Amino acid sequence: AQARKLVEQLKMEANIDRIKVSKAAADLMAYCEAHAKEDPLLTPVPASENPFR
Amino acid sequence: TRVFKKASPNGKLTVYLGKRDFVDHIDLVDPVDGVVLVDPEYLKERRVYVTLTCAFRYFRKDLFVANVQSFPPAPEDKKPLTRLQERLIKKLGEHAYPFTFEIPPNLPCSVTLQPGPEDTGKACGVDYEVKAFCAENLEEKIHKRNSVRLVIRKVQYAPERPGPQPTAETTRQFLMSDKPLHLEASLDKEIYYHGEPISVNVHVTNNTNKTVKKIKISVRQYADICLFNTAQYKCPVAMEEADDTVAPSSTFCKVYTLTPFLANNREKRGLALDGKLKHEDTNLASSTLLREGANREILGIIVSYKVKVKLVVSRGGLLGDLASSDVAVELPFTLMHPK
Amino acid sequence: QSELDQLRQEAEQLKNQIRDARKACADATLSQITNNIDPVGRIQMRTRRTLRGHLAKIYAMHWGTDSRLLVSASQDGKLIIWDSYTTNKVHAIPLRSSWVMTCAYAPSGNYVACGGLDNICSIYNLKTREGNVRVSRELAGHTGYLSCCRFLDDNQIVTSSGDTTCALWDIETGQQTTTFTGHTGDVMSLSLAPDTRLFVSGACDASAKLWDVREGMCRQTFTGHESDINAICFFPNGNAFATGSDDATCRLFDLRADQELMTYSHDNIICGITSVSFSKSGRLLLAGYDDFNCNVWDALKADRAGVLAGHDNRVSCLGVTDDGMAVATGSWDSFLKIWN
Amino acid sequence: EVWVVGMGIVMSLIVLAIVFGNVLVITAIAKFERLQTVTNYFITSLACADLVMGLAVVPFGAAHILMKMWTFGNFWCEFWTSIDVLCVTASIETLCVIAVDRYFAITSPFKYQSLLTKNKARVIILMVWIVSGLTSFLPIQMHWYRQEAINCYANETCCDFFTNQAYAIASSIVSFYVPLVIMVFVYSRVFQEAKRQLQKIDKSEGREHKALRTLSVIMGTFTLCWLPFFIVNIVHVIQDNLIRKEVYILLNWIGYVNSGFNPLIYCRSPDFRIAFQELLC
Amino acid sequence: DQRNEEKAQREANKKIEKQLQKDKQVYRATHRLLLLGAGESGKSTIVKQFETKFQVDKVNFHMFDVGGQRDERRKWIQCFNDVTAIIFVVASSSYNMTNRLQEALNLFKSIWNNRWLRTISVILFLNKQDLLAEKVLAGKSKIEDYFPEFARYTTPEDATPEPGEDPRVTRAKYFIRDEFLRISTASGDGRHYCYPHFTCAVDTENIRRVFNDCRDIIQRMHLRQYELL
Numbered sequence A: 001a002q003a004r005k006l007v008e009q010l011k012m013e014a015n016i017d018r019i020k021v022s023k024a025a026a027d028l029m030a031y032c033e034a035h036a037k038e039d040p041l042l043t044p045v046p047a048s049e050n051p052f053r
Numbered sequence B: 001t002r003v004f005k006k007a008s009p010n011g012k013l014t015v016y017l018g019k020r021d022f023v024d025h026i027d028l029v030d031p032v033d034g035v036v037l038v039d040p041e042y043l044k045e046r047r048v049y050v051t052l053t054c055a056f057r058y059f060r061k062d063l064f065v066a067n068v069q070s071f072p073p074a075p076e077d078k079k080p081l082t083r084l085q086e087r088l089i090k091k092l093g094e095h096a097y098p099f100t101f102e103i104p105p106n107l108p109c110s111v112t113l114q115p116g117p118e119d120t121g122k123a124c125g126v127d128y129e130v131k132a133f134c135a136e137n138l139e140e141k142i143h144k145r146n147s148v149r150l151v152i153r154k155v156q157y158a159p160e161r162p163g164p165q166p167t168a169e170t171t172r173q174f175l176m177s178d179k180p181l182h183l184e185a186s187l188d189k190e191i192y193y194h195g196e197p198i199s200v201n202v203h204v205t206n207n208t209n210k211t212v213k214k215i216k217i218s219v220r221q222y223a224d225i226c227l228f229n230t231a232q233y234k235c236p237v238a239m240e241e242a243d244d245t246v247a248p249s250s251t252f253c254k255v256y257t258l259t260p261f262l263a264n265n266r267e268k269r270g271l272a273l274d275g276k277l278k279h280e281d282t283n284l285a286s287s288t289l290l291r292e293g294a295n296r297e298i299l300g301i302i303v304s305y306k307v308k309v310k311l312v313v314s315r316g317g318l319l320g321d322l323a324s325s326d327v328a329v330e331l332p333f334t335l336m337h338p339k
Numbered sequence C: 001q002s003e004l005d006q007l008r009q010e011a012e013q014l015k016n017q018i019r020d021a022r023k024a025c026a027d028a029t030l031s032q033i034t035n036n037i038d039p040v041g042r043i044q045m046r047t048r049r050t051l052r053g054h055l056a057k058i059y060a061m062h063w064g065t066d067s068r069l070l071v072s073a074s075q076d077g078k079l080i081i082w083d084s085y086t087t088n089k090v091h092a093i094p095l096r097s098s099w100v101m102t103c104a105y106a107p108s109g110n111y112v113a114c115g116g117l118d119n120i121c122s123i124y125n126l127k128t129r130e131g132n133v134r135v136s137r138e139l140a141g142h143t144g145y146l147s148c149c150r151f152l153d154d155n156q157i158v159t160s161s162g163d164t165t166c167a168l169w170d171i172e173t174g175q176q177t178t179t180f181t182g183h184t185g186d187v188m189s190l191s192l193a194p195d196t197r198l199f200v201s202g203a204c205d206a207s208a209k210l211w212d213v214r215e216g217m218c219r220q221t222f223t224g225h226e227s228d229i230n231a232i233c234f235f236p237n238g239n240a241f242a243t244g245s246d247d248a249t250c251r252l253f254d255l256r257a258d259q260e261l262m263t264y265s266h267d268n269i270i271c272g273i274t275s276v277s278f279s280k281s282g283r284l285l286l287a288g289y290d291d292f293n294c295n296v297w298d299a300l301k302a303d304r305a306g307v308l309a310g311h312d313n314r315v316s317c318l319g320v321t322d323d324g325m326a327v328a329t330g331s332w333d334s335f336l337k338i339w340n
Numbered sequence D: 001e002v003w004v005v006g007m008g009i010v011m012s013l014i015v016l017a018i019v020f021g022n023v024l025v026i027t028a029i030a031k032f033e034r035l036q037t038v039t040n041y042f043i044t045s046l047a048c049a050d051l052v053m054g055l056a057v058v059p060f061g062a063a064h065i066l067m068k069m070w071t072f073g074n075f076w077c078e079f080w081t082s083i084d085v086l087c088v089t090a091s092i093e094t095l096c097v098i099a100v101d102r103y104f105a106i107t108s109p110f111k112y113q114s115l116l117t118k119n120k121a122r123v124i125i126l127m128v129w130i131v132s133g134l135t136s137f138l139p140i141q142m143h144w145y146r147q148e149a150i151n152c153y154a155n156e157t158c159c160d161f162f163t164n165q166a167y168a169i170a171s172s173i174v175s176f177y178v179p180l181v182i183m184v185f186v187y188s189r190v191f192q193e194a195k196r197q198l199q200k201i202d203k204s205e206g207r208e209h210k211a212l213r214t215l216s217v218i219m220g221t222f223t224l225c226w227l228p229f230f231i232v233n234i235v236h237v238i239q240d241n242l243i244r245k246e247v248y249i250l251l252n253w254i255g256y257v258n259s260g261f262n263p264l265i266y267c268r269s270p271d272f273r274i275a276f277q278e279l280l281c
Numbered sequence E: 001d002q003r004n005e006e007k008a009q010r011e012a013n014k015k016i017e018k019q020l021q022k023d024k025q026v027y028r029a030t031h032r033l034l035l036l037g038a039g040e041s042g043k044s045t046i047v048k049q050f051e052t053k054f055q056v057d058k059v060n061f062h063m064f065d066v067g068g069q070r071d072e073r074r075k076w077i078q079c080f081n082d083v084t085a086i087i088f089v090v091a092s093s094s095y096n097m098t099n100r101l102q103e104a105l106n107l108f109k110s111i112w113n114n115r116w117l118r119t120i121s122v123i124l125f126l127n128k129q130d131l132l133a134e135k136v137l138a139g140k141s142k143i144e145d146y147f148p149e150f151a152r153y154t155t156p157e158d159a160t161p162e163p164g165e166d167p168r169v170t171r172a173k174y175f176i177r178d179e180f181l182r183i184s185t186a187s188g189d190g191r192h193y194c195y196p197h198f199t200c201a202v203d204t205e206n207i208r209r210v211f212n213d214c215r216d217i218i219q220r221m222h223l224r225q226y227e228l229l
C-alpha cells in the first residue's frame, strides 16, 4: 500500500507548471546580483564601521 | 549493430546478443539482453531454458546461477522489448523469443590469473558463461549438440573523480630512525591509465646520526584473491633502483617515474590479468572498486595496487645495529582504463 | 502481484514524466550564464571572535533576527546565548537531555528551542517573569530523534526528525497541527523560506523535498544526490536552495526550474558536507566540511572564494546574520569561531 | 691553535640548536589552540626553563671558555651563575613534574582529570619554579655559597665556581638527586603498569618490547647527560685533587645538551607534529 | 549608561562563566557510556543492574540506551564518540535464529568500522549464558552448524576451569567469543580494543566488571598517548 501513497505524492508533482532553466537562471543571477551592494561578507570591510573589528 | 550470433550446433537454437563487454561503472550494470532463436519444429522437450553462471575456476566452484524459461511466454515478467530487441524480433522472424538477465551486484570483475607454462589447458579465474539449452526437466544433462555457451565479461572503467593526492610520513624505528629522520613521499593523482607512467617525489631529510643507503622504489599488486574462505597475495609489478648519495643533513628531493608494463612480468605466476575471451594477449589487471567504498565485503577476486618506498641504512657495527632497521611507506592508487 | 506490478509501472511512467520535465529545461546551463561576472575577490575571512565557553562538541546554531545574539547547543547539556559583538554570555540553559542536535532562535527574539535524541523539542521562554529561563512547553515529539527545528513565528514551529517525517507544531497547544510524511530515511535538516510559507527538508534518502505548510503537499522533490543530504538552506530570494551531501557535493536546486543548477566539487575534496548557508545576496554560498575546513563557494563560478581554518574537527554548524554582517562557524572542538 | 677554533664552532652550533628547538616548541604551543593541554602546560614550562638558559647562559659560558677572563664584572658573574643554577634546576624539576604527571595519569586514571586541572597545574608549576628560585638566586646573589677563592672573588676578572660543601650538597640533592629518585620510582611504576597491560592484551587478544624503546629515551638521555656531572660535583666537593677544572667543565657541557634534546624527547607525537609541520610555511 | 550596560553584561558573563566552570568540574569526573543491543538481545537487566546514572567506587558512570534503533544506526552514532566505552549486548542463545547472531556480528562490525567510532573501544557482553547452556545441553539444534564457520575452531587452548561446565558448551563459547574477536583484530588501530566478557540472567557482578574495563580503557588510552605502548 506504500506505492499507493507514492503515486498520490507523485500526482501532486505531476501537474506542475515549471519554467525553463534559461529564464530561471537569468532571473536568479540578475535579481540576486542587483540586490548585492550590501553584502559585507563579500567586499570586506565596507568602512571603518566594521562592527566585529 | 553487428549482433554476435553463435549458431548452436545441429542447425538449431541460435542465440543472439548485443555488446559482450557489459559495464559496471561503480554500481549497477547493463542487463544481459538479447534474443534467442528457437525453431519450434521438434518440441520434444517443450521447454527451452537459458542460464547465466558466474563460475570460478582453478572444478567450477560457481558463484551465482540464474535460470530463465522462455519457450512459454512466462507471463510473470513484462520486460520491455529492448532497443536492439525491437529490430531483432523483426530480423530473426517468427521464432525470435527474447531473454534478459538482470544481474544485481553479485560477482567481481572477470579477472583471469596468469597461467603457468606447461600449466595451462583452460582459463583460470572469474568468467561468465551464459549457457543455453532445451530440456523438458530442470536439471537433466543436455550437453551433446543443442548446448551453447557465450563468454561475456564485466569490466569497470575510470570514474570521474581524480581523488586527493596520496601522502604518507614515517618518523622512527628500531635503532635506525633515531635523530630526526622522516620521509615525505607523495604522489601526483589517484587515477592512472594503463601504460602511462606514474611519478613519485621524495623529501627525505636525514638529520640522523647515521648514514642511509640508496632507496628502492617498487610497485606492489595487492591481489586479494580466494574462493574457499579467504587469502591474500602480493606480487611485484615494477621496480626501480636509485643512487647511493644521501649524506647526513642532506634533504634529497629527487623525483622518479615508474611505468608498470607487462612486457617484463610475463613469467610471474599469480599475476592477475584482465578478462580473456579465448587465451588472448590481454593487458594488466585493472584495480576494482572495493564494494563502493562502503561495505568492504567480497566473495571473489579483488585486485588493488600500491607503491612502496624502501630505505636502506647499511648499519655499521655492534651498537645494537643488527635489527629491524628499514623504514618504508605505502601509497595506494587506482590504475584503470579511461572512458 | 498484479497490483504491485501496476503500481511499479505507473511509478516508472511518473518518473519518466518527471525526468522529461527536468530535462526540458535545457535551453542552457550555468556555463553560458557564467560569463560577464567578475571573479570574486579572494575571500580570506579572519576570525574576529572566538567564543570559548562550551565543554562538549557543538552541533547547531542560529543567529537572532537582531544579528547580535547567537544560540548554540552542546552535548554538555548547555545551550548558551552568546553576544557576538562583545563575545560574552547572556544565558546558559541546562538541558534535561545531554544530547541535542538542534537549536533555534525565535524571529521576535522571545523564545529559544532545542532538541535531540530525547525526542523532545523543548521550548524556552527568554522573557521570563523575574528569573532564569524556564522550559515553556516541551513538545510531544515524534517517533524518531529530532534533527533540526526552526521557528515559523513565536506561536508556530516546524521540527524535523529521524522518523522520516517532519511536522509543523503549535506551541500554544503543544500538539501537531499537521505532519509531513513521504520520505524514506531519516530527515537530517530543514530550512524555512523568506516568505515563511514553504520549507524543504533533505533526508537520508538523498532527496530534498519541498513542503507546503498549508496542507502538507510535497510539491516538488529535488533529487539528484548519491549520498544523504546533511544540510540545506534557502536562497535569499526564496527561489532556490543548496543541499550539501556526504558525497562532497553542494548541488543547488531551483524551485521554478525544478532540477539541479550546479554540482559543487573540486576533484580533491573527499569528505562530505556538514552545513550550508548563503550570504545576503547568495553569491557566497558557504559550506562546512568533515575535514575541519570550510570552503566558500561562489554561487555562479563554482570555484572557492577562500578556505576557512581553525577548528580541528568537523564544523557541524554554519550561519549568516539576517543582515549578512558576518558568518559564524562551530565545530566539535567546543569553540565557536566568528568569521567576519 | 685548532682546539680553540674547533670548540668555537661547536659551541655556537649547540647554542643555536637548543635555542631554535625550544623556541620552535614554544611557538608550536602558542600557535594552535589545540596544543593547550594540562600536560602541555608542564611541557611549556620545561621549554621556557630550557630556553631562557639557551640565550642567557650558554653564550656567556661559551664566552668564558673561549676567553677565560670574565670582563662582564663581579656582579654579572654572580647573576650568570644564579640563572645557570635556576635554569638547570628548573629543567630537572620540570622533568620530574612531567614524569609524576604521567605516573598519576596511569596509577590514578579515574582521578587524574579532576585532580590535575588548569589551576592545579599552574600552582604546581609556580611552586616548582619558586623552589628553583629559592636555591639558585637567593644563595648565589646573597653569598651563602662562599678560602682559595677568597682572593678570586675579590679579583674582578675570574668567575670560577668555588661552592662550599654545604651549598654543594644542598643544591645537588635539591636539583638532581631527589628528582632522580622521584623519576626512577615513577617510571618503575609506569613500566610495571605497561607490562601488566601488555600481559592482559596477550592473554585476551593474543594471536617489554615497546615499553623499553620509550623508557630508554625518556629515562636514560637525561641520565647520561646529567648524572656524571652531578656525581663529579660530589667527588670534587668531598675530596679535592680528584677531578680537574677542564673535566668538570666538559661534564657540565655534556649535561647542557639534554635541555636541547628534550623537545625531541617530549614532543615527537603526531598531534603536536602536525602543528609543527604547519609552521613550515 | 552605555558603560553601565557593558558592566552589567560583563557581570552576567562572569556569573555564567562561574556557573559553567562548576558544570565543567562535575562533567569531567563523569564518564559516558553507550548501552547497546539488538532489540530483544537481552539488554534488560543490564540497563537496571534512558539515563542510568550510577556511581561505583566513588566514580560516576551513566549509560544511554539508544531507544528503538529503527535503521541507519550511523545517524546517532556521530554523537556517541565522547563516551569511554560502548556496552554492547549480544544474544548468545540465538544461534538457531534470520540468524540473529549473524545480524549481531554484522552490526558489531558496523559499529567497529565507523570512522567516527574508530577510537572508541567497545565492551562486549555475551548474555543468556544460562540459556546458552540450556540450549546446548540437549543439542536438538545443531551446536553451531547454522553458523557453518565452526569447522576447525575446536580448542583455542584457552583454559576455562570454571566448575559446573560442559566441554561442548566451552567450545561453543570460545567460538562465539572469537566470532567478535576476529572482527576486533581485523582493524589494528591500537586505540580502541575489544573486551569480550561473559554475563548471565543472574550476574550480580557487572557493576564491577564495567568499572574494571573502563579503567583498562583509560589506562590504555593514556599509554598510547605517552608512547609507552
Ligand SMILES: COC(=O)N[C@H](C(=O)N[C@@H](Cc1ccccc1)[C@@H](O)CN(Cc1ccc(-c2ccccn2)cc1)NC(=O)[C@@H](NC(=O)OC)C(C)(C)C)C(C)(C)C
Pocket (backbone or CB within 6 Å): B172, B173, B174, B175, B176, B177, B178, B179, B180, B209, B320, D212, D213, D214, D216, D217, D219, D220, D221, D223, D224, D261, D264, D265, D268
Ligand atoms: C626521537 O629520537 C630522539 O630524540 N633520540 C635522540 C637519540 O637518542 N640519539 C642517539 C643516542 C643519544 C641519546 C642521548 C644523548 C645523545 C645521543 C641515537 O643516534 C643512538 N640510539 C642508540 C642508543 C641506545 C641506548 C642508549 C642509552 C643507553 C643508556 C642510557 C640512555 N640511553 C642511547 C642510544 N639510537 C636509537 O635508535 C634509539 N636510542 C636509544 O636510546 O635506544 C634505546 C631510539 C630510536 C630508541 C631512540 C636524542 C634524544 C639524542 C635527540
Ligand SMILES: Cc1ccccc1CC(C)(C)NC[C@H](O)c1ccc(O)c2c1OCC(=O)N2
Pocket (backbone or CB within 6 Å): D081, D084, D085, D088, D089, D159, D160, D161, D163, D167, D168, D169, D171, D172, D175, D176, D233, D248, D249, D252
Ligand atoms: C661557573 C662555572 C665554572 C666552571 C664550570 C661550570 C660553571 C657553571 C656552573 C658550575 C655554575 N653551572 C652550574 C651547574 O650546572 C649546577 C647545576 C645544578 C646544581 O644544583 C648545581 C650546579 O653547580 C654545582 C652546585 O653546587 N649545584
